[PDB]
T-cell receptor, first 199, second 238 residues
Framework: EKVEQHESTLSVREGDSAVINCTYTDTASSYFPWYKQEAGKGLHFVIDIRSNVDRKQSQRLIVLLDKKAKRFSLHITATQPEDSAIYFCAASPNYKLTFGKGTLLTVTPNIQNPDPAVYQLRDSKSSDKSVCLFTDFDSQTNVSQSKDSDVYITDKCVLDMRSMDFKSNSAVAWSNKSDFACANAFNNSIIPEDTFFPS | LLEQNPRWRLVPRGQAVNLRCILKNSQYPWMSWYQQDLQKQLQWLFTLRSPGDKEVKSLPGADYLATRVTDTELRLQVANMSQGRTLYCTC????????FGPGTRLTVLEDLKNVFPPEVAVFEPSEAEISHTQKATLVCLATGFYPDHVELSWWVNGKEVHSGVCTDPQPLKEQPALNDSRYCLSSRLRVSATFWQNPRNHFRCQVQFYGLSENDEWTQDRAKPVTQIVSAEAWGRA
């Protein structure tokens, strides 16, 4: 038995729909569960389907099974960023689970009022050292990790100020060098044109 | 439901390691081991029902001996680890649904010589950002640590906060070329500018590092890079 999981990485905008597609080889297989793994955490059960049934729905989740074609799929309506995780499909007849390689699902949040900006931040004791912070940018902006191995750049990351109901993207950069300041930091990344660069 | 100890472990080449999994509810007597490799692929190892059952099995690259000692305890010995991995204990009733425990993470090092704890620094909100957005972002930088076993958290006036926080999901390598490169991780806490501007408000990022124990030998002049917390702080300014 091998279980194939077709999509490896899956990036989708908040609110839109997603699918993951799996196939299995061993016709004895009759139980097909799905598990998710939020980064740096354990595996949590999501939903399952058995051999009697073709379609099962639970809240925003739907699973399909076609036994004849030996394929099955997870459908997520109205993705939220909380859905971001690695999803795994599995199959079971030896009553063990055979697992697919996983699909990384990223749900990028919809930034209501973009305000792209690159700010400089000082050490609380002291000063320089300092760090450059790219923030408030739109989800469709992509941050690239620089072509100079002596300057460090984080990937984008989403935070949620739960009240007042506000989400924001952020990336951090820093070096130890002469020739590095915030004006030049995210050169190498597209970056909007209206990015605020203060003094 | 299911406890596994330890939750983490350092393993130099040569050392074996023992893992325990205690079942906390007798309705799910069927207990199993699954490995999850560094590429995230899960693979079943064993399922042991009765006390006294033991089995052996070899995968690339780790060798496993598993033993169901009691009706509620399952043990696993892991030896000859080339590549690191994570080990999940599962339990089940009639084998159908499988509940996965919290897992034990194993990292493998050639040398103990290259373990280091993190240095931690907090960077205070830009004034520009406070004027422009009426919001304040603290950044926390944990640098120079190895292996990548840190848990970063933010503490505001002595209580832990989750709102406003985002930590990098992946640490980045300081010298990406090297095989045993020390790591670095950033995190951000974002608050209202009014809250940052109260100087009675105290901020700390805390980095739990996981490193050597009493049982690990240590030969070098610098301090033994033991399991420890490293913190950094900042105060509100008006």
């Amino acid at each position: 038995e091998k279980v194939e999981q077709h999509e490896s990485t899956l990036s989708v905008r908040e609110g839109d729909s997603a699918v993951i597609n799996c196939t299995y080889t061993d016709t004895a297989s009759s139980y097909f569960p799905w598990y998710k793994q939020e980064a740096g955490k354990g595996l949590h059960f999501v939903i399952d389907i058995r051999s009697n049934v073709d379609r099962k729905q639970s809240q925003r989740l739907i699973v399909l099974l076609d036994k004849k074609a030996k394929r099955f799929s997870l459908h997520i309506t109205a993705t939220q960023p909380e859905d971001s995780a690695i999803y795994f499909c599995a199959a079971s007849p030896n009553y063990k689970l055979t697992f697919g390689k996983g699909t990384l699902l990223t749900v990028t949040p919809n930034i209501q009022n973009p305000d792209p900006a690159v700010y400089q931040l000082r050490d609380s004791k002291s000063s320089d050292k300092s760090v450059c912070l790219f923030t408030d940018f739109d989800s469709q902006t992509n941050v690239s990790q620089s072509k100079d191995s002596d300057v460090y750049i984080t990937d984008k990351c989403v935070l949620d100020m739960r009240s007042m109901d506000f989400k924001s993207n952020s990336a951090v950069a820093w070096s130890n060098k002469s020739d590095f300041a915030c004006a030049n930091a995210f050169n190498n990344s597209i970056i909007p044109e209206d990015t605020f660069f203060p003094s | 439901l299911l406890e596994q100890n330890p939750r983490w472990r350092l393993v130099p080449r040569g050392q074996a390691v023992n893992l325990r999994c205690i079942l906390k509810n007798s309705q799910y007597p069927w207990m199993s081991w699954y490995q999850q490799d560094l590429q995230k692929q899960l693979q079943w190892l064993f399922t042991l029902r009765s006390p006294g059952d033991k089995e052996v099995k070899s995968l690339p690259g780790a060798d496993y001996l598993a033993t169901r000692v009691t009706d509620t305890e399952l043990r696993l010995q892991v030896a000859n680890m080339s590549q690191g991995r994570t080990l999940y204990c599962t339990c089940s009733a009639g084998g159908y649904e499988q509940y996965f425990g919290p897992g034990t993470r194993l990292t493998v090092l050639e040398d103990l010589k290259n373990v280091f704890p993190p240095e931690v620094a907090v960077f205070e909100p830009s004034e520009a950002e406070i004027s422009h957005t009426q919001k304040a972002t603290l950044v926390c930088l944990a640098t120079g640590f190895y292996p990548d076993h840190v848990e970063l958290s933010w503490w505001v006036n002595g209580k832990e906060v989750h709102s406003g926080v985002c930590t990098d999901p992946q640490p980045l390598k300081e010298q990406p070329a090297l095989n045993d490169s020390r790591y670095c991780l950033s995190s951000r806490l974002r608050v209202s500018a009014t809250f940052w501007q109260n100087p009675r408000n105290h901020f700390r990022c805390q980095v739990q590092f996981y490193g050597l124990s009493e049982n690990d030998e240590w030969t070098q002049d610098r301090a033994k890079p033991v399991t420890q917390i490293v913190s950094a702080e900042a105060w509100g300014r008006a």
